[PDB]
Design a protein around this nucleic acid. Structure first.
Lengths: 63, 139, 53, 206, 56, 143, 70, 63, 141, 56
RNA sequence: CUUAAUUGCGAUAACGAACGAGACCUUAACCUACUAAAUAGUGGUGCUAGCAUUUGCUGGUUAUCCACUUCUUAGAGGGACUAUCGGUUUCAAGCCGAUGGAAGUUUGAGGCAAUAACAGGUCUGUGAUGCCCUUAGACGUUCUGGGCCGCACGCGCGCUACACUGACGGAGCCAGCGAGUCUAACCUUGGCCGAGAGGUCUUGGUAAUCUUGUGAAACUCCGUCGUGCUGGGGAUAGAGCAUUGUAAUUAUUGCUCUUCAGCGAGGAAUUCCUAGUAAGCGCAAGUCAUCAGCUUGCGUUGAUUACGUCCCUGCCCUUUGUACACA
RNA sequence: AAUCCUGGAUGGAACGA
């Protein structure tokens, strides 16, 4: 099962809370930005966080 | 290869050395029907004799059969290498005889009874009817 | 895993890694003894040979 | 059709068929077609193939099995009973000889003969034990097309196996006569006998 | 001399372990934490990390 | 266009070259032939038996033409198989070394195979020419 | 150990008369007619393809496949 | 040899003791607009076609 | 110098390297012709890359293949993969990407692991069994 | 035993650990064994962070 | 409601925390982009062999070079995050399908793995150990020799098998995980002798370089059998030849010939298993002077059948009843 | 612009410490 965990969701929520005038809807540049911006200790977490931020950005743009 | 038209002189019980050797099969295994000889020995014998091994046993006229039997009972006289034999070195006389008869059973029994005479462990186990080649007798 | 025999027959593979490198250097001998007295480090074994022909 | 000779000499005689329309060097997956509706989804024909080895991943999701070629499924069903696990090559050769024989007898597409055998051996009704709570009865239920074709293949291969077992007749010969006597409703084959048994048992239990 | 690298490194490990047990049994009073070995040319040094450097 | 032993199927080439060696009648046959099993893990002698030495000779001639250097132990590995060890599981067992050794010696005698540097036996240029001409005749058969 | 090791006069005639009438001929068929055993079935099939009576479409051992000729 | 085909339109739910039987809503091409509920043994996709030996039936949920 | 490429095909162990240079038709394997490979069945499996394109697309080149590792079937699949990949590599580097797309479309409409390698690999063995998922037979008394 | 273990825990968490744990197993105040278990702060049991951080 | 998951959405007399799970680590799969590499390969050029000769084809070659790194090794990195699209869901967490992709069941397999307990196993692993016993015709230590293998029987793992998708005899040749000699005698190539096992003269390797392209088997090409307890099952048992070891006798093993048993698919009962898995097939290591039918791993060939249910055996949560609490 | 509608069950044996 592919349910995201609270570390991922909370980090994404924070990144949206304080870096919304950045963070395009694209996973790739969101990922590179996560690298630029957060001391994440693993590529896998970085990519999961980027994916969830992208998901939240999408369902922000549509409401 | 091609199909022959063999004729009804074919005999299909023709016997050698006190055993009803079957016919209508191949001669090597027909001979393995005999005691004391097996597939390897029979093939060697029928090779040393100039014989068509792709031919059944009810063929093989009697001079051929007796040449075969002579090779069997006196093998070393036809350059059979003497490691091929069964009762090699033969503690009665110290020569290499091939036991191909009911002599196989008689000599089996004689070996057992001389072991019993000298009171060998192998002979005592043979007496009681147990296993003797060094096996677990739990099963 | 167990000292004794009782239990589910559980196994354990321990493993050691051994990494190995080699370099070839066309050197004069003063630099050779300089570079053998340089670069000493724990946990690493160094071998040197000359005239590989 | 005009040959293309080449430094490495290809056999032109079969280069013809090679670079022509596609088939197992003999038999087309053109005019051959499944006689029956209801099971025109579970016979792969179109796509075609060359030979029935096809090291593919079909038993993965749910129905790529159904998209697999029936000939591969026959080889796969022949490859069983312990001493024949693996030996997909033996199975492919057996199928080669079997289709050769089904062409020799009954000049026809043996692919079509096999398909008719399958669709005529597929049992269209089967029994299941309902629960109840300790004393329940068999209930007649319908049978899906996929289970129809699977049980068909199983029955054919098992009949051929139990025939050829301890008999001079070769497994290819047994499979051939069984597929023939199943393409026709001969009622001499293990497959159709079992089909009739199951169907009338269901009729009894309804 | 002239020993394979596998057995060489296994021997290094067993040497470390034997030294560890030895200094554990001896330098108990002295707060023995651990050891380190550093092999060099001309010399091989053995560092002993312990609490107090008065008794050792 | 030119031909080699790599251009001909192995079974047909070995049959042709074994028949050629049998018709030429000049390799050797040792004398303890038709009195051996060819492997300790076998259970019967060969069934050809007015032969099988030209077959083994043709096979190792093609094998040496393929490789660089083979020795006797390599051929014992190559011609050995699974020994049925009665009621215990099977095992790979190398073939009879005396057969392969005497085949290699007879092929040195007829001049197909030469001794090699870096050990083992090598194909000779005479044997290379003979094998190529036999392969030419082999695929010449099908016209 | 049942039947038909060697023909010895007449199954030559029976073979040469009857086998061009079949649709499919192989060892198992010649035997399930309880004619010739398997060894002679192989031999006879080689003989008949030699003479050109039967049309062969086999390629290897352990399964022979012959039909009529025309 | 009267036999009736039937196209599946709604796979309903799995049914039976061990869960090896599936309830299916079927609509058959000759005289469509006459839907039935039946039970089936094997795998089913919807838009699949059945072969009913009898159509004068209607299954209940097996227990 | 002469135009050439080199590609590879894989199936579980068997890397089959394929050099493809400009030539005059010649196709060959471990040092022979593709008419003779093995085991008389899967010769059509190795021919498959040659026919779906149409044999005219080889007269101007020289394929040479070499294999190691695996078994007979694995090596067959490796060499057909290698032939296809070498062909499309040649048609990329020296012929137009349009014809490349055509060849790739054919080989991938077929796609029994012809360009893309089979991702399957052996699950390891684990204690308690002769194999990975299989377990020994327990008794209960 | 309580004084000893809690003194260790105090000294460690003063030294600046994220956490400690002291298990004392055996015969305490009786014959039948009992494992006392003392702790403070934080602790992990799983993963590579065990091999990295905790010292046992 | 959802998830493999007290995993989340969220609801809310609870708030904010910790452990576990997950994260993490290792391995397997992708990279014609980086760093390179006679201890891995390739190409070409010399020299050389055979066939063709008209260019060509298949080979060999250490001090012939020169160039390169696709294949092989690694080190640093990248890559997948269920991406995109469409459905479904209060429209949230999520789920389903297709597309592309090396890879779309937490990508696969594992490691680490909570609280509380069992009066589980183990004093025969420990110079880990309390108490008790024994402590110099000593259950201390050591030497000789036997036994741990002993048989009317019952049980549990397993190995061969009961045959023509099969045996045999020739022609089968394609693997991967490994290990290996110092004050030594290990892995052994090549040549020679011998039917065989194996013996002898040299050589290489302290190892990506030598054993070893571990040219393993199953498997494919040709034939011989031919349905018969048969030639395939290969137990017993006789005789002989070697090897290991001080010593092989109740046979250590290996080889040769002979003897050629039961077993024709196993009631009642019952195990394991859903994909490169089951099964078949062998190989290395472990123990080891020698001896595998064992185990641990490796690869080779590679199916059928579900993609569910709680009916049997059990597990988690909630509610409920209890005269139970070593439950 | 046509247009009549449906929710629903049971199912044997199982002693002891």
């Amino acid at each position: 099962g592919r349910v995201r965990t609270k570390t991922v969701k909370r980090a994404s929520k924070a990144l949206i809370e304080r870096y919304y005038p950045k963070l395009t809807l694209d996973f790739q540049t969101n990922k590179r930005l996560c690298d630029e911006i957060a001391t994440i200790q693993s590529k896998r977490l970085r990519n999961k966080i980027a994916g969830y931020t992208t998901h939240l950005m999408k369902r922000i743009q549509k409401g | 290869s091609l199909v022959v038209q063999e004729q009804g002189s074919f005999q299909h019980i023709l016997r050698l050395l006190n055993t009803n050797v079957d016919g209508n099969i191949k001669i090597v295994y027909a001979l393995t029907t005999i005691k004391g000889v097996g597939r390897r020995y029979s093939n060697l014998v029928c090779k040393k004799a100039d014989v068509d091994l792709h031919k059944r046993a009810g063929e093989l006229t009697q001079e051929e059969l007796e040449r075969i039997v002579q090779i069997m009972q006196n093998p070393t006289h036809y350059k059979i290498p003497a490691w091929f034999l069964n009762r090699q070195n033969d503690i009665t006389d110290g020569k290499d005889y091939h036991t191909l008869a009911n002599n196989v059973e008689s000599k089996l029994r004689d070996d057992l009874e001389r072991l019993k005479k000298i009171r060998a462990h192998r002979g005592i186990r043979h007496f009681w009817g147990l296993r003797v080649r060094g096996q677990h007798t739990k099963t | 895993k167990t000292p004794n025999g009782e239990g589910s027959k559980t196994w354990e593979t321990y493993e050691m890694r051994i990494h190995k490198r080699y370099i070839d250097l066309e050197a004069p001998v003063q630099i050779v003894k300089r570079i053998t007295q340089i670069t000493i480090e724990p946990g690493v074994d160094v071998e040197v040979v000359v005239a590989s022909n | 059709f005009t040959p293309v000779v080449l430094a490495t000499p290809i056999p032109e005689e079969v280069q013809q068929a090679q670079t022509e329309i596609k088939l197992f060097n003999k038999w087309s997956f053109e005019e051959v077609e499944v006689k029956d509706a209801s099971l025109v989804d579970y016979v792969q024909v179109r796509q075609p193939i060359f030979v029935a080895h096809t090291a593919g991943r079909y038993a993965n999701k749910r129905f790529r099995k159904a998209q697999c070629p029936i000939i591969e499924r026959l080889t796969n069903s022949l490859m069983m009973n312990g001493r024949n696990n693996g030996k997909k090559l033996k199975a492919v050769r057996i199928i080669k000889h079997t289709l050769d024989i089904i062409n020799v007898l009954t000049d026809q597409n043996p692919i079509q003969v096999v398909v008719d055998a399958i669709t005529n051996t597929g049992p269209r009704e089967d029994t299941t034990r309902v629960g109840g709570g300790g004393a329940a009865r068999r209930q007649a239920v319908d049978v899906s097309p996929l289970r129809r074709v699977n049980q068909a293949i199983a029955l054919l291969t098992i009949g051929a196996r139990e025939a050829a077992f301890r008999n001079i007749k070769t497994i290819a010969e047994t499979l051939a006569e069984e597929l023939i006597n199943a393409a026709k409703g001969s009622s001499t084959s293990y497959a159709i006998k079992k089909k009739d048994e199951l169907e009338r048992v269901a009729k009894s239990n309804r | 001399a002239l020993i394979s690298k596998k057995r060489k490194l296994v021997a290094d490990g067993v040497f470390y372990a034997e030294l560890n047990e030895f200094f554990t049994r001896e330098l108990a009073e002295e707060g023995y934490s651990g050891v380190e070995v550093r092999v060099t040319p001309t010399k091989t040094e053995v560092i002993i990390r312990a609490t107090r450097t008065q008794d050792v | 266009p030119g031909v080699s032993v790599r251009d001909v199927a192995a079974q047909d080439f070995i049959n042709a070259y074994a028949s050629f060696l049998q018709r030429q009648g000049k390799l050797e046959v040792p004398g303890y032939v038709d009195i051996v099993k060819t492997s300790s893990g076998n259970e019967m002698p060969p069934q050809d038996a007015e032969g099988w030495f030209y077959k083994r000779a043709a096979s190792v001639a093609r094998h040496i033409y393929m490789r660089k250097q083979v020795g006797v132990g390599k051929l014992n590995k190559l011609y050995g198989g699974a020994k049925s060890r009665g009621v215990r599981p099977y095992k790979h067992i190398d073939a009879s070394g005396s057969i392969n050794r005497k085949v290699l010696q007879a092929l040195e005698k007829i001049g197909i195979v030469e001794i090699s540097p870096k050990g083992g036996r090598r194909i000779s240029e005479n044997g290379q020419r003979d094998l190529d001409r036999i392969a030419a005749q082999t695929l010449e058969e099908d016209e | 150990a049942q039947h038909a090791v060697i023909l010895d006069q007449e199954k030559y005639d029976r073979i040469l008369k009857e086998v061009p009438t079949y649709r499919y001929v192989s060892v198992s068929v010649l035997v399930d007619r309880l004619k010739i055993g398997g060894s002679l079935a192989r031999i006879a099939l080689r003989h008949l393809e030699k003479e050109g009576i039967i049309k062969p479409i086999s390629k290897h051992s352990k399964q022979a496949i012959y039909t009529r000729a025309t | 040899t009267p036999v009736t085909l039937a196209k599946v339109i709604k796979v309903l739910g799995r049914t039976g003791s061990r869960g090896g039987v599936t309830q299916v809503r079927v609509e058959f091409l000759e005289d469509t607009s006459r839907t039935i509920v039946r039970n089936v043994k094997g795998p089913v996709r919807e838009n699949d076609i059945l072969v009913l030996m009898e159509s004068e039936r209607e299954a209940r949920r097996l227990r | 110098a002469v135009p050439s490429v080199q590609t590879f095909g894989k199936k579980k162990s068997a890397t089959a390297v394929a050099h493809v240079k400009a030539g005059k038709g010649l196709i060959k394997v471990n040092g022979s012709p593709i008419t003779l490979v093995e085991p008389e069945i899967l010769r059509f499996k190795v021919y498959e890359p040659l026919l779906l394109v149409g044999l005219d697309k080889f007269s101007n080149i020289d394929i040479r293949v070499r294999v190691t590792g695996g078994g007979h079937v694995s090596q067959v699949y490796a060499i057909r993969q290698a032939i296809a990949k070498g062909l499309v590599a040649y048609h990329q580097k020296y012929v137009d990407e349009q014809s490349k797309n055509e060849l790739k479309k054919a080989f991938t409409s077929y796609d029994r692991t012809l360009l893309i390698a089979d991702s399957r690999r052996p699950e390891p063995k684990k204690f308690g069994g002769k194999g990975a998922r299989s377990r020994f037979q327990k008794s209960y008394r | 035993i309580r004084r000893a273990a809690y003194g260790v825990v105090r000294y460690v968490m003063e030294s600046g650990a994220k956490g400690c744990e002291v298990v004392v197993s055996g015969k305490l105040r009786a014959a039948r064994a009992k494992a006392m278990k003392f702790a403070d702060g934080f602790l992990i049991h799983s993963g590579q962070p065990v091999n990295d951080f905790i010292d046992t």
